[PDB]
Design a protein around this ligand. Structure first.
Ligand SMILES: [Ca+2]
Ligand SMILES: [Ca+2]
Ligand SMILES: [Ca+2]
Ligand SMILES: [Ca+2]
Ligand SMILES: [Ca+2]
Ligand SMILES: [Ca+2]
Ligand SMILES: [Ca+2]
Ligand SMILES: [Ca+2]
Ligand SMILES: [Cl-]
Ligand SMILES: [Cl-]
Ligand SMILES: [Cl-]
Ligand SMILES: [Cl-]
Ligand SMILES: [Cl-]
Ligand SMILES: [Cl-]
Ligand SMILES: [Cl-]
Ligand SMILES: [Cl-]
Ligand SMILES: [Cl-]
Ligand SMILES: [Cl-]
Lengths: 156, 154, 156, 156, 158, 154, 154, 156
């Protein structure tokens, strides 16, 4: 079970918040010299800790006013879970999809311009999928918090 | 005014947040200087809100991922107080007020059930604004990206 | 109370579909001369059988792309229902409100431009009303049928 | 499309509540001369903003004392949704039907003389529809508000 | 114990009376192959034992214009003497024929009769929901009666 | 057509189906013969449909009262077949097709959970027309009368 | 039939199942021979069905305790096939057919959510007789004993 | 902590099923001499691995023919949880009580002679507890499986 030191956590905490920092900029943030700082970054990156760097966008800025959480009930037939998994990976409007432990078989998170766009997706793609028994959706009224930064204080 | 090129820039940067302008301009078929102008404007307008290192939960021993459905107390200030506190809980990555029976959906990460339990009993349910909560946990990730769809703009 | 016959039913059927027929046009299709037709229609109005003539609009034509069914739970406090009723009647986005027999205390039918408008209303107006314990909402994916015409065949 | 101003909105606000006003009456209320007023209404009709004029009746006055909200669960089979939609459009007791985003696949609003008539409809027509999986209903205890007027001032 | 107390002919008497509560002793005795005197003694024991708790005329609801039969699910408020106060009021409401505290999510299940939905609505809005003990109620209505008897099964006593 | 006196007759007999005409006459404030004649009209109008002895469940070792919520199979004749079977199960006193989520509500009596369990598992759930069933049991009987309200008729 | 002393023996042994007969008899105020006779009769009668060492779940790295609500498919032998399988799943300690909307409630133990996920996805949901399952997890154990109440017998 | 080898596991597997085996019998089972076996068991006890030895009884043999699973809703005040836990620990008919992650706050497992006894407990002890908001229950129709033995193969 992974264990990091005080400054390696600091590095990871800076990178999560600012994925596009030069080494000097990171060095300054974590209180190291660029050489030791770069050396630390290597090993973290080489450990698989960092899986991707991403630009995160404002959904409103690209006319995606509608954010849906869709609860999908899967058909109880063979390959339905697999087939559905495969299709969801090819739907760009669905950002995330998890098999969950409760009543909802799959929770999907998806973005749309408006309800008309959402309606076309649900009726013409989602519910028509041979592996999908049913779906029900709720929508975002307000984003309270949304970060991609994982908690790391358990590592110290 | 986002055209085919602005969209491509956005699509490339969502997948590869750490691309050099050299590689960016190449992938979006622009000379370096026009490309750097476009990106900067996209950044200044707030279309690009942040660049982020995305870590692997497993790699950092966060094996338990929770979706917590929170029922808020029906009292003045509860919603604000709760929102204010959730912003200070680093195990909670996102919190959305929703349109259905669930008032707030939280997505959070923990090492194991023990850590989750300490959070729920001693922090979440003990918050004066929280009436109740129930949770589900991830059995399997089928998909997870931070990339928004952009095709509707085209 | 009026006694409605074949001809009165025909009048109501004709006007439910075509509310703006002139008396001459109405009289032409119902088997009453224009004078008795005029008189009978005023009787139907005066009896409260015809409660209103309305122009019906297309929601999409006036940028109302979001139609919501809002299930509201009322607080068990004195005046909650009465204060809620009074408020609902002054909320223009809300077209219909019915106290119902099942688990939902009140069902509201409302129109909005988009989810953002819906959110402002739910958060700033509905959920902040002192009589309102909670709300949950569903939205129209597709209109299969929508008429204002009541069935009248049982009267024949 | 058309560009709507205060006067156009007023024309629409007035006709939504007073569907049967003569052109002269309408022109007096909206502060337009009869000729321009006539032209303008034709344009609003032609644009599809005004889709119908209807006499609205009192359900009680025509012995339709039971108003049902029916939540219908559709069978997951090919053509079930379309066969159901086709049939619903031929059932005069059902005034509206909407496919919704939540747990209910379709919400129906229907009027009946009484529970007897409801029960005949449900047992002999609705639940026996090959496309219908199940139905459950709620009935109106009290009407708090019921209008057909859409809110328009967002256009100003 | 009833198994000890009641024999095959005492069962027969209870079955007969459950279906035909207005039989004289001579009639009852004739259907149970008993003489009036013993038959009357046996019935007396059954009434004194509390086995037969009541005789009643059962009416057709439709014949008295009671077209609406409701099953009402009531949630009690968690307060001192909410349950007691509610039971007291429900015992006074003639439209409610039966009320049970149940083991599941529904706190109380009520069975009630009304002429139509308007009368149901007046009861619910003005009487039931206004009651300080009542947190909430939700109701279903009979589409069709498949079976309705008051006769208890007695074969286990044999 | 029913007047105040007809209402009194039905009210009285609902509570005591064994009352002699003499006693009934007194309670409804009629002479014996006009009272006997009114009651025959009511019996012949269908208004009185039955006279019944009502027994104590506890007295006959039926200490378990169940309300069973049955989901019917969505098939031709599953309803008709379930209905025909229910009519032949003496432990089931009442069965109604309802308007809500519960397709059929059955009211039934058993000695104990043991006998209930045998009924549920070997008779109810094994029926071809039964999709599922779930049950609640009586904790306390607050009220139980067979008497209909009649005040609406006056 | 169980007298006051038999009850005492059962009370003591439910809490201390490995006591010597000498120790046992000292705690019930009996000589060893009578105490030994009594215990043997209780064992022969089937009253004491087993002696068991009880373990700390956390001590053996079983930090996740699950309650699994399983819906059985409506098909011939599904229930029986599901029962037989459950009996061969060591992670499942108990399984009850219940009266409410949950057909079967299982109590099971796992090291963590990863192990739980494997069991649910690869074993449970893949069983032909399982239509659906949903689970909850222990946040805190408030009380857990194996001792049956015996005061009703006194 | 105490690190378990295969022979410690075998001791636990054997004693979980037969908690009353003598040291001679236990050591024979697990392929040890009596003395080492005695020491190993003591250490497993001292480490808290074996927390208790128990005589397990047949519920039916002692007239406990009703087994209930009680889903309790706790009153949402700071005192309710601790007061309920304290009271539950003193109710012998409740064998186990767990706070769960789902909608049910606490799940109780409890035994009674019959529905009379259960009802008395629920109405007069449980529902009347100041910390209990509500409770709902299910009952065992059939025990498919019931053991106290934990699985231990993950340790091998
Ligand atoms: Ca599911
Ligand atoms: Ca809510
Ligand atoms: Ca409600
Ligand atoms: Ca659905
Ligand atoms: Ca309840
Ligand atoms: Ca149903
Ligand atoms: Ca079930
Ligand atoms: Ca809860
Ligand atoms: Cl999966
Ligand atoms: Cl929208
Ligand atoms: Cl909020
Ligand atoms: Cl559709
Ligand atoms: Cl009605
Ligand atoms: Cl019982
Ligand atoms: Cl011991
Ligand atoms: Cl043993
Ligand atoms: Cl875990
Ligand atoms: Cl043993």
């Amino acid at each position: 079970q992974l264990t990091l030191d005080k400054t390696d956590i600091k590095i990871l905490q800076v990178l999560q918040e600012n994925g596009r920092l030069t080494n000097v900029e990171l060095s300054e943030r974590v209180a190291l010299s660029p050489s030791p700082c770069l050396r630390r970054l290597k090993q973290l990156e080489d450990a698989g800790i960092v899986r991707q760097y991403a630009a995160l966008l404002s959904p409103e800025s690209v006319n995606l006013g509608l954010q849906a959480f869709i609860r999908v009930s899967i058909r109880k037939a063979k390959d339905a879970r697999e087939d559905f998994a495969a299709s969801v990976r090819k739907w760009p409007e669905v950002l995330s999809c998890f098999a969950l432990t409760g009543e909802t078989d799959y929770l999907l998170q998806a973005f749309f311009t408006d309800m008309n766009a959402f309606s076309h997706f649900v009726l013409d793609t989602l519910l028509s999928h041979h592996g999908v028994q049913d779906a029900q959706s709720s929508f975002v009224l307000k984003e309270i918090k949304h970060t991609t930064s994982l908690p790391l204080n358990h590592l110290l």
